[PDB]
């Protein structure tokens with residue numbers, strides 16, 4: 342039975358509005374309703390992995406697991422295995438996988454982050470799950486961010502706290518946050534970004550939604566505008582939105598948006614908004630294709646509609662050779678030529694690099710680079726031809742060209758990372774000097790760039 346080179350992943354996010362679900366929710370897992378929907382001819386084909394994020398979830402873990410498993414069994418005739426479940430307050434993540442994957446999944450991690458301080462600590466935050474699927478690392482984050490149209494900057498802060506403090510994936514990757522730890526990272530939830538138009542325009546917005554004319558609404562969506570201005574979710578991707586706003590509905594119909602200020606809303610307007618979102622970030626040149634992104638039309642117990650997204654995702658096998666794992670393969674090497682980091686920092690410490698990758702036995706520290714002043718005020722750290730030759734555990738090009746090198750640039754004075762990035766080994770050629778590039782981030786904000794050339798030797 343061959344190991345897969347691609348899997349499909351279902352991502353669901355639903356703010357349940359503290360109400361139990363209706364008796365049938367299969368439309369969610371079938372990607373049917375509005376937006377980019379799944380073809381009817383696929384209905385019986387199970388996804389490999391289902392990741393369900395809920396917010397304002399009133400159910401016990403047992404109660405929800407029973408509903409989810411019975412839903413999937415009805416659709417697929419498959420009894421899914423529970424990989425992980427984790428709840429913070431009323432924020433929950435469930436991961437289910439086909440039974441055939443049970444011995445492909447390992448290193449399962451769960452964690453949560455509570456956002457805010459005092460007043461603002463006690464119901465918002467995030468849960469997450471990570472695991473290895475054969476040779477591929479997968480991370481999943483369900484976040485319920487701060488509500489309210491005038492709190493976009495709080496949501497951006499909540500994002501920054503979650504990616505700093507959520508402890509998922511390989512703890513040996515100590516310089517790297519969750520935005521670098523995984524081959525594929527999916528981040529979803531009630532992100533709570535709103536359509537920023539005047540309150541007086543509520544009925545105009547409603548009109549536009551009835552005409553399925555979303556363009557003048559999406560141009561005011563705070564998540565799209567904040568992302569464009571690099572304030573949040575830097576280096577993530579979202580599929581184009583082609584479904585109606587998923588909030589705020591009157592319960593038990595989808596015919597009415599309930600936007601007016603009420604005592605129950607703290608006298609806040611809730612103009613129709615795309616609160617409920619799915620974004621992802623995959624390592625460079627790894628296959629990932631969104632095959633659905635939409636909302637259900639027939640699940641009406643909440644003031645939010647469920648959102649679904651599905652993905653094709655490239656995966657790799659747990660590679661064994663005669664040599665690695667447990668030794669190097671002398672037929673393999675990675676060389677970095679003419680490399681330099683450009684950093685936005687005002688500081689004047691020396692810097693060194695760390696190279697981290699599961700193709701190495703352990704991470705590799707470089708010598709200090711040579712600081713120069715850039716023409717436009719920047720710090721340029723030159724490494725020249727000084728960088729250590731990296732010795733991969735396996736030299737087979739079928740393995741090595743699928744790998745990635747994480748890079749951290751660290752202060753010699755503090756050993757703190759000033760920037761993290763990632764280089765693919767999926768090169769156009771081997772034994773050939775080729776340009777490489779990554780942006781560098783720290784706490785998920787842009788701090789610089791790393792560029793130079795690579796020369797990869799494989800056994801072929």
Ligand SMILES: O=C(c1ccco1)N1CCN(C(=O)C2CC2)CC1
Pocket residue numbers: 577578579580581582
């Ligand atoms: O998140 C991204 C993105 C793509 C690549 C890097 O980031 N986008 C662009 C594509 N989108 C659109 O709405 C375009 C009309 C198709 C949705 C937002």
